[PDB]
Amino acid sequence: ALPTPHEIRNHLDDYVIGQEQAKKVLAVAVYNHYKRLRNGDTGKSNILLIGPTGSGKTLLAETLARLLDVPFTMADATTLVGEDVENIIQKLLQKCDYDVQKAQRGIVYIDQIDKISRGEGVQQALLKLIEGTVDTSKILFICGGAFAGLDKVISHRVSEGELLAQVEPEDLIKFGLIPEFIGRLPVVATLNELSEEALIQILKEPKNALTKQYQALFNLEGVDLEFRDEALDAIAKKAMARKTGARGLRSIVEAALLDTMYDLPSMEDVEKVVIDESVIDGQSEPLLIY
Amino acid sequence: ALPTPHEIRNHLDDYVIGQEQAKKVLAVAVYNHYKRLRNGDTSNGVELGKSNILLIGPTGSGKTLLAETLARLLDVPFTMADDVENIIQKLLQKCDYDVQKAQRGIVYIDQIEGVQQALLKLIEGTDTSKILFICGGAFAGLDKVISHRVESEGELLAQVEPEDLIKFGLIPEFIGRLPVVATLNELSEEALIQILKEPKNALTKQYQALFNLEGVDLEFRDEALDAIAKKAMARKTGARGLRSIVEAALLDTMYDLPSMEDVEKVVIDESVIDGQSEPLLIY
Amino acid sequence: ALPTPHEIRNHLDDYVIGQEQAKKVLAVAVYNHYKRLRNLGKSNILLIGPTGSGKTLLAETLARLLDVPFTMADATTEDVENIIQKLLQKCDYDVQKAQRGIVYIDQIDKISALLKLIEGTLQVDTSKILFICGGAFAGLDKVISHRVESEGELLAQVEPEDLIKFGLIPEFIGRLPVVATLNELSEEALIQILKEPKNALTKQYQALFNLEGVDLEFRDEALDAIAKKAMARKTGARGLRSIVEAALLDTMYDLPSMEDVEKVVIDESVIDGQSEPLLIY
Amino acid sequence: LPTPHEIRNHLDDYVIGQEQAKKVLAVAVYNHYKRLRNGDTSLGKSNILLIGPTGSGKTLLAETLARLLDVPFTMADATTEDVENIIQKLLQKCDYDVQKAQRGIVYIDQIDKISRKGVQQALLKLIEGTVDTSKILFICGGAFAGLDKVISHRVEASEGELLAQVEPEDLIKFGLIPEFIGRLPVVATLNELSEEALIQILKEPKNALTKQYQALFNLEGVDLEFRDEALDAIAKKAMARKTGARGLRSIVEAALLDTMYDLPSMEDVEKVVIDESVIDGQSEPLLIY
Amino acid sequence: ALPTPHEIRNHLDDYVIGQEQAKKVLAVAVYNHYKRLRNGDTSNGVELGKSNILLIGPTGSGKTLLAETLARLLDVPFTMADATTLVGEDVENIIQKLLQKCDYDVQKAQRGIVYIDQIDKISRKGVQQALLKLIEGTLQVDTSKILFICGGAFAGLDKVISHRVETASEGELLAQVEPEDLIKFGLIPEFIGRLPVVATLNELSEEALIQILKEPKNALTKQYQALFNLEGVDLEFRDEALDAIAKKAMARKTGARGLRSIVEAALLDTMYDLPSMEDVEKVVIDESVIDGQSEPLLIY
Amino acid sequence: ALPTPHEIRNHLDDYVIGQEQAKKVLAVAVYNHYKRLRNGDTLGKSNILLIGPTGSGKTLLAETLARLLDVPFTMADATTLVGEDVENIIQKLLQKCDYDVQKAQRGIVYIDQIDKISRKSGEGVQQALLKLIEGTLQVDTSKILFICGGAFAGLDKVISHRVEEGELLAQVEPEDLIKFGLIPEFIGRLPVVATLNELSEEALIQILKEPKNALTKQYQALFNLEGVDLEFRDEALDAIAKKAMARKTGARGLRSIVEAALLDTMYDLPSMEDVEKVVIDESVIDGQSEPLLIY
Numbered sequence A: 001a002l003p004t005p006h007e008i009r010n011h012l013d014d015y016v017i018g019q020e021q022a023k024k025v026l027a028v029a030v031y032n033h034y035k036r037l038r039n040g041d042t043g044k045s046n047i048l049l050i051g052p053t054g055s056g057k058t059l060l061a062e063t064l065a066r067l068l069d070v071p072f073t074m075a076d077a078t079t080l081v082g083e084d085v086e087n088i089i090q091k092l093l094q095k096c097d098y099d100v101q102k103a104q105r106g107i108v109y110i111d112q113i114d115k116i117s118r119g120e121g122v123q124q125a126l127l128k129l130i131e132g133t134v135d136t137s138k139i140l141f142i143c144g145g146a147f148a149g150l151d152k153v154i155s156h157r158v159s160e161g162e163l164l165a166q167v168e169p170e171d172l173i174k175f176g177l178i179p180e181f182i183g184r185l186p187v188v189a190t191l192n193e194l195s196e197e198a199l200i201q202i203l204k205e206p207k208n209a210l211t212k213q214y215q216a217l218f219n220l221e222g223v224d225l226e227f228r229d230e231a232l233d234a235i236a237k238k239a240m241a242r243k244t245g246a247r248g249l250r251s252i253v254e255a256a257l258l259d260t261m262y263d264l265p266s267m268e269d270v271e272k273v274v275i276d277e278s279v280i281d282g283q284s285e286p287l288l289i290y
Numbered sequence B: 001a002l003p004t005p006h007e008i009r010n011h012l013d014d015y016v017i018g019q020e021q022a023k024k025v026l027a028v029a030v031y032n033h034y035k036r037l038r039n040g041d042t043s044n045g046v047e048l049g050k051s052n053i054l055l056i057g058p059t060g061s062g063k064t065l066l067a068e069t070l071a072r073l074l075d076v077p078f079t080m081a082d083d084v085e086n087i088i089q090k091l092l093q094k095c096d097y098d099v100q101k102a103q104r105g106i107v108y109i110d111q112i113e114g115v116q117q118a119l120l121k122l123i124e125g126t127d128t129s130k131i132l133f134i135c136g137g138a139f140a141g142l143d144k145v146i147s148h149r150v151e152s153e154g155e156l157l158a159q160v161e162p163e164d165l166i167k168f169g170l171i172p173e174f175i176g177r178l179p180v181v182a183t184l185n186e187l188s189e190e191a192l193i194q195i196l197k198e199p200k201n202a203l204t205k206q207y208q209a210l211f212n213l214e215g216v217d218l219e220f221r222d223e224a225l226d227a228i229a230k231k232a233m234a235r236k237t238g239a240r241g242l243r244s245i246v247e248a249a250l251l252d253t254m255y256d257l258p259s260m261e262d263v264e265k266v267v268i269d270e271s272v273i274d275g276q277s278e279p280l281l282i283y
Numbered sequence C: 001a002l003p004t005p006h007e008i009r010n011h012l013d014d015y016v017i018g019q020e021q022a023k024k025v026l027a028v029a030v031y032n033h034y035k036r037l038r039n040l041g042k043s044n045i046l047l048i049g050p051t052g053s054g055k056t057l058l059a060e061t062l063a064r065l066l067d068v069p070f071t072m073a074d075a076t077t078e079d080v081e082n083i084i085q086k087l088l089q090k091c092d093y094d095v096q097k098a099q100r101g102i103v104y105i106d107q108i109d110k111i112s113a114l115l116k117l118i119e120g121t122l123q124v125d126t127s128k129i130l131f132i133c134g135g136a137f138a139g140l141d142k143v144i145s146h147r148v149e150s151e152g153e154l155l156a157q158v159e160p161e162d163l164i165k166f167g168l169i170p171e172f173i174g175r176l177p178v179v180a181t182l183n184e185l186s187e188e189a190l191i192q193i194l195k196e197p198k199n200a201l202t203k204q205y206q207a208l209f210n211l212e213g214v215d216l217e218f219r220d221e222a223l224d225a226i227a228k229k230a231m232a233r234k235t236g237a238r239g240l241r242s243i244v245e246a247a248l249l250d251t252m253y254d255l256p257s258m259e260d261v262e263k264v265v266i267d268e269s270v271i272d273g274q275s276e277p278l279l280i281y
Numbered sequence D: 001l002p003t004p005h006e007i008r009n010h011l012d013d014y015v016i017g018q019e020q021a022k023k024v025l026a027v028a029v030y031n032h033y034k035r036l037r038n039g040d041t042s043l044g045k046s047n048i049l050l051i052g053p054t055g056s057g058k059t060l061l062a063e064t065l066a067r068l069l070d071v072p073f074t075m076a077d078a079t080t081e082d083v084e085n086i087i088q089k090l091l092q093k094c095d096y097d098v099q100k101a102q103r104g105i106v107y108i109d110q111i112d113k114i115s116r117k118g119v120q121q122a123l124l125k126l127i128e129g130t131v132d133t134s135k136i137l138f139i140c141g142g143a144f145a146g147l148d149k150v151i152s153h154r155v156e157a158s159e160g161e162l163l164a165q166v167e168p169e170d171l172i173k174f175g176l177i178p179e180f181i182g183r184l185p186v187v188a189t190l191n192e193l194s195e196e197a198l199i200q201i202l203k204e205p206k207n208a209l210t211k212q213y214q215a216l217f218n219l220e221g222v223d224l225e226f227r228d229e230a231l232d233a234i235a236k237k238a239m240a241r242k243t244g245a246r247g248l249r250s251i252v253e254a255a256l257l258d259t260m261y262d263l264p265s266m267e268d269v270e271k272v273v274i275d276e277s278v279i280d281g282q283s284e285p286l287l288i289y
Numbered sequence E: 001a002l003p004t005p006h007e008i009r010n011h012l013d014d015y016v017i018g019q020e021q022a023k024k025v026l027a028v029a030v031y032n033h034y035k036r037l038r039n040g041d042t043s044n045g046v047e048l049g050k051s052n053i054l055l056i057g058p059t060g061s062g063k064t065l066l067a068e069t070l071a072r073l074l075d076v077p078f079t080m081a082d083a084t085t086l087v088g089e090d091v092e093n094i095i096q097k098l099l100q101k102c103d104y105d106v107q108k109a110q111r112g113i114v115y116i117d118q119i120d121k122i123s124r125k126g127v128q129q130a131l132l133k134l135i136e137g138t139l140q141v142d143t144s145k146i147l148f149i150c151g152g153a154f155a156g157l158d159k160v161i162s163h164r165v166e167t168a169s170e171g172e173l174l175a176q177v178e179p180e181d182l183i184k185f186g187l188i189p190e191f192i193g194r195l196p197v198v199a200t201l202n203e204l205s206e207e208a209l210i211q212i213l214k215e216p217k218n219a220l221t222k223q224y225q226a227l228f229n230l231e232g233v234d235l236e237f238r239d240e241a242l243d244a245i246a247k248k249a250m251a252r253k254t255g256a257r258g259l260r261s262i263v264e265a266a267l268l269d270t271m272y273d274l275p276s277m278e279d280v281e282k283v284v285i286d287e288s289v290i291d292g293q294s295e296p297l298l299i300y
Numbered sequence F: 001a002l003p004t005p006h007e008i009r010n011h012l013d014d015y016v017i018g019q020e021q022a023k024k025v026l027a028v029a030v031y032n033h034y035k036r037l038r039n040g041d042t043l044g045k046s047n048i049l050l051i052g053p054t055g056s057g058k059t060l061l062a063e064t065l066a067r068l069l070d071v072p073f074t075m076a077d078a079t080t081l082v083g084e085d086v087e088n089i090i091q092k093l094l095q096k097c098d099y100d101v102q103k104a105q106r107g108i109v110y111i112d113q114i115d116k117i118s119r120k121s122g123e124g125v126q127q128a129l130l131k132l133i134e135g136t137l138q139v140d141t142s143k144i145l146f147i148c149g150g151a152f153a154g155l156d157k158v159i160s161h162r163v164e165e166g167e168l169l170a171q172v173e174p175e176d177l178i179k180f181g182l183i184p185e186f187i188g189r190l191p192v193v194a195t196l197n198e199l200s201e202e203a204l205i206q207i208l209k210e211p212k213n214a215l216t217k218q219y220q221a222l223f224n225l226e227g228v229d230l231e232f233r234d235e236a237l238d239a240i241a242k243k244a245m246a247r248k249t250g251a252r253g254l255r256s257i258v259e260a261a262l263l264d265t266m267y268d269l270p271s272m273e274d275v276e277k278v279v280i281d282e283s284v285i286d287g288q289s290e291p292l293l294i295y
């Protein structure tokens, strides 16, 4: 039984924060794609994700795959080679037990599509798959990307989110994509820039959140790691100022706990408390409790 | 067995709307091209002239679509272009590297001095003599030069002459290679409405089928279709910007559709233009 | 008795007219050539005019007016002496009369060996025969402009150095002292272009229709009508195909769907364009 | 498991300087084996990326870390079905023990060389894990020449001050793919050059200078012997000129020039190269008949 | 018997006007070349250096004329060639042509002269290296023996030399010419070293041009007087008209190559309706040339 | 039997004057190259990079080494460089080698003006020619010896900005060539680096006299078959030397001076009857005074 776009967006709220509009657009696009497949046809319903780095694009594509127990595989548009284009396919079969049908129900995420925008040979080569020649007609294609200059071209025609909403196929044309490639991506879902509160929730809520990991790394040391809310907010701010999105959270946390993890096993105390001054300033050492 | 110019123009009506004249011209020229290849370059002691095509129409008129359609209709290898020999190898990529079938192919050049002469060597052939070349282009200033000689845009583009293209910016040795000149006309408001309804793959039909497998009947009131037309003209996106309007109009409805139980959903003009009013729902 | 340049240009007006000034240069060039043989510059000729200006027709007419063996040759196509043997073929293999012959070389501007002939070396010598080298010279209109600082006024300022920068070598241009530039072509010469050539428009379409099982017939009135239509648009012969195609469009569109003997193109089909071609079953 | 202190302390006995990278390595290494000994969780990959000039001691550090933890070690060149060859070689020096081979360390040299600016994705399959390669620690070394430039075009002192401002995006623009960099969370950067490392360069490699010349002399019927003092001299000379490992041949050649000129015109058993020959350059290499 | 360089330059004065210095350089270059061939490549244990020539002068200066003249004066097989038409198998085509005008005699073909026009055109600023294979020497004939004269205007050469000598007129600057200047121009060192002898020509003058229209046995005036002569009409060129023609040629910078283009255009009308008249003679005045409006005087 | 580096440097003294240090380097470099091939390897490529001013004798050295080892030699200009044109150098090596695969693998290949392709298409050539240097007709380019001349103008500077002309070129380092415009993978293929010096007045003078084919000997012979004895006073030869140095044309700019000095003299020589012509410094430096004629 296929989950309604409601059940899909609902389950997406359990992994990705915000981007509600992008999760509605994806839910509908996904439901329509598998609803069209389970009825043997009689639109390709392929997807183009347009959002900043660390917005949750790749996470969304992987989540959709799990929620539908469907074989999923990634790929970078930078590593693209015509015989390497089918390599993505064999990888989908590898994680599909080499089942032709279940592999046709699969989802394929292509990262950094905005990077190959003239390169044009890759667009046309990968274009052969999107259409279909196992047949690649059945599988869903999700093309992520940051599209930097895109925010400019759209403005030259019409916040960053309000501008990305007025996105048009002609805008992607001027950006560097070819017509025949854009016509294969009818569904365009745009994600907004993550705020601070979302980032803080990413550091806490998820079952694999950074804090939980380090609290577990410090836990097997016999030490209790405590992240004060001020410290988490500081990390969020530290990440935004670097525009690294949620991808630049670990690079902050590691740098903050570096010294402490170094001379931790050579100490004997109860717990270590990380304050905001430890993050922002980076000068002050973390609180130590014996 | 080659499809008569009638059969070709007929199948072209199933994907492209209007431009009936451009379709006759394309149908004839295409028929003569492949009728020429099967018989041979030389026929009865006389050498037959290659009839390459030059599409002259506004952006989003259907030039690229036409070229594509013609290729599919004739199950012939097709490839676009905007390194000159790179186009050929690509034609070979989609042709299974078959030399013969790749000579029967069609090559569309979009947005048509050194490049003119470099691409000219292909048009002639060195083989690239066999393949058909369709050169698209909007030719903005062309509407002016023609007016300064002959003394709507369609009536003027009909008076197009090889000399007009010369003054435009093309070289004589390149234009002589494009005997067939097909001109597409300005799309009308009524034309757009027909694009949403008439074609066998028109938008309304796609969605009426998407909603249909939901057990729901989707009904587009003519007002809504006219609204979609205007909305598309104000954005100058032509026919390319139609889907972006329909999707946006039916976004909310498709979201919580499989979560309801009703007979049909009706899209009024208020749902398109205003975008504030939700589509009528009938249980 | 050799015809004075007057008589030569006068007879040239029966086959070609228009811009003039080349029929004079050619008349002078030609007169001097045979006035020099029957008794000193080589007096070879270089025709520089748009396609369909009547360069080819001009060359042939000159041959007929002087009852002299004529033969053409494409600059695009041991093969160099092939032109000679052909000149002997139309000359009854008469060495002397073949030396008085005229040779026209088309599309010279495209090649920017043959030089060895122009000079002169079968046993016949190529020093005696007159060489007329035609060509459109597209980029030539530009190089002249970048120096002197209508296309006709520019082609009048033509200089051997302009042909050099164009793509012609000095030793080859020095062999062609006489340089004639023509624009437009006479109505008659146009009619002959649609007929005479081995690749004439009517022959092509007559062959195109021929493989349909249909016989295409062009009435002289139609050919005349195509000629005028071409002059009114100043497109010359380059604007001939754009008339024929437009005249035979409808016919070729629903031709493969018919079953009839032949199709006849009257003048009413061309000029008026309203009346449909005569159809015979 | 040895504390990062004990680890950094033992690293000081084989490599000089680069204390910061040695801390970064001690922590990342400790956290990697501390995470394996507890079977993850009933956790980051903790993989390492070494960014330092050639001859800085990257390779040396990787080997030392392996010996200090009595863990199976194996190298590999990013320049050279062959991806799993490194694994079988790791099992070769591990007595084919699956478990002990999983706790092993793998050093990949010249990663900056494969930066497209397929191998990255192929090797990426291992970093993730499919014996499973998930358990083993990966240390990816490299000089990253153009890296010093891209960081400067973003941050806007010494190369060391710029390599400290290194960011994942800088590597992206350099030529590395996102999915590959995300696998190397730990980035340690070396500054100055290592002396003992250089000496190992002149000896250890299968194509080392001394080995090449000893052979050149060998086909002369002469045994070339390099005294460790001379090799040390050559290392120092290379550091003073900041030429690194690239400026070693230019030193050896210059040191063996006169010898090779009038060697074929002599008849003796072997030539010995002392430190006096190299540093002073005044004394001629000892000759034995 | 070989003509002393003097006899060579003297005979060069009968076909070329001015350019005395370059004629001197050629005379010596030519004399030594054949004086070298007859004696043999090697002379008295020492190997004599091949002295090929590089002519550097404006267009229509007389470069081609000098090369041809030298060839006739020594009754030696001559052949031209353009550096623009240059193809490695086409480089030997020049040789087969030399054999064609030499009755396929190997030895006499080796004594031949080969003029290469527009060398300055092939300056990259391959062919230089391909043609360089001939200059050195490798049908079975060897190209070592044949003398090579490489012509060329070298437009930009007048500039580079100025940017060097500075640390007068074009003539004074071309005199300061140096192999390194040709290097910077666009010629490869190995190619320039093959052209030791460098003769430069000066830009023609009015007085010279007028003598060009008169003195030579094939001067334009003599040709047209002959063309008019077989018409029964005597053509008279007034010195003023000849002067006018000179000036017209100078203003166009066409040199001596643009003289015929001036005479033809001046005598066009006259030659057109000449065979349709019956008079004694025609006299071309300056008014007929410069103004071009006035028709030539007609005498019955 | 391979000639010891001594014998090699010795025979190089008989064609090239000075450059002793470079000759030694080349002598070792060459001997090791053919000592390594003769034993079928088993080893460094032993490829050479000549760095000297124009007309110092780089090309001469390469040609002399070839002849001394009776080995097929061929040149090539880095300027004329096309990836399929690089193998043209090979077919040419086979042309002068009677198309013998083995002997063509023993050959020497000189590439002139390498300093010119330094990107400071150029880099593309370096990497293209680099494929040869490594080794891939059917002949392999791993066996043949590659010598790459070049003036390296700006090199004199970069070296100075580091060490802080001959004494500076001696301090040459592979990193200096890097900054110059050569890629690392290319320089690493040219381990041996011989540097030449700017020919001294005395060296130039010797060039005009000593060589069995010296200019003076040629002209003395050309004049000799005229029945005239040519005398070059040492002052004139030095005068010519200075003239060639001020122009920087190295030794390539010698003939261009002598021919110019003896122009007028050879013009009206066959038209005279005297014993001998004596060329004083005044004939060259002044250029104004005519040569001394003796009857």
Ligand SMILES: Nc1ncnc2c1ncn2[C@@H]1O[C@H](COP(=O)(O)OP(=O)(O)OP(O)(O)=S)[C@@H](O)[C@H]1O
Binding pocket: A015, A016, A017, A018, A019, A052, A053, A054, A055, A056, A057, A058, A059, A060, A111, A112, A144, A145, A146, A194, A202, A245, A246, A247, D178
């Ligand atoms: N909206 C979100 N809600 C919750 N977690 C998020 C969100 N966005 C990112 N993350 C987390 O932050 C990490 C960022 O990595 P990715 O999701 O791969 O970034 P990305 O934006 O998909 O990178 P791209 O688009 O391929 S350049 C992921 O592991 C997510 O778990």
Ligand SMILES: Nc1ncnc2c1ncn2[C@@H]1O[C@H](COP(=O)(O)OP(=O)(O)OP(O)(O)=S)[C@@H](O)[C@H]1O
Binding pocket: A179, A183, B015, B016, B017, B018, B019, B058, B059, B060, B061, B062, B063, B064, B065, B066, B110, B111, B136, B137, B195, B199, B239, B240
């Ligand atoms: N006359 C028409 N009838 C039906 N659909 C059309 C028509 N014109 C355009 N379209 C559709 O709108 C889209 C516009 O893309 P194209 O057809 O490539 O436009 P185009 O005018 O060919 O663009 P150019 O000429 O390359 S700038 C196509 O995907 C067509 O499906």
Ligand SMILES: Nc1ncnc2c1ncn2[C@@H]1O[C@H](COP(=O)(O)OP(=O)(O)OP(O)(O)=S)[C@@H](O)[C@H]1O
Binding pocket: C170, E015, E016, E017, E018, E019, E058, E059, E060, E061, E062, E063, E064, E065, E117, E118, E151, E152, E153, E212, E216, E256, E257
């Ligand atoms: N110094 C001169 N004395 C007499 N007649 C000359 C002189 N220079 C040129 N002419 C004549 O003017 C004509 C000019 O043509 P050329 O001699 O071919 O010019 P050119 O300078 O040789 O052209 P190049 O060097 O090949 S670009 C020749 O036919 C000569 O007869």
Ligand SMILES: Nc1ncnc2c1ncn2[C@@H]1O[C@H](COP(=O)(O)OP(=O)(O)OP(O)(O)=S)[C@@H](O)[C@H]1O
Binding pocket: F015, F016, F017, F018, F019, F053, F054, F055, F056, F057, F058, F059, F060, F112, F113, F149, F150, F151, F207, F250, F251, F252
């Ligand atoms: N050291 C030397 N001893 C004797 N003769 C020399 C010496 N150097 C140059 N020559 C002569 O002077 C001439 C100069 O030409 P080349 O040797 O080609 O100059 P080059 O320095 O090799 O030029 P490059 O390296 O290609 S820029 C040669 O013909 C040599 O015969």
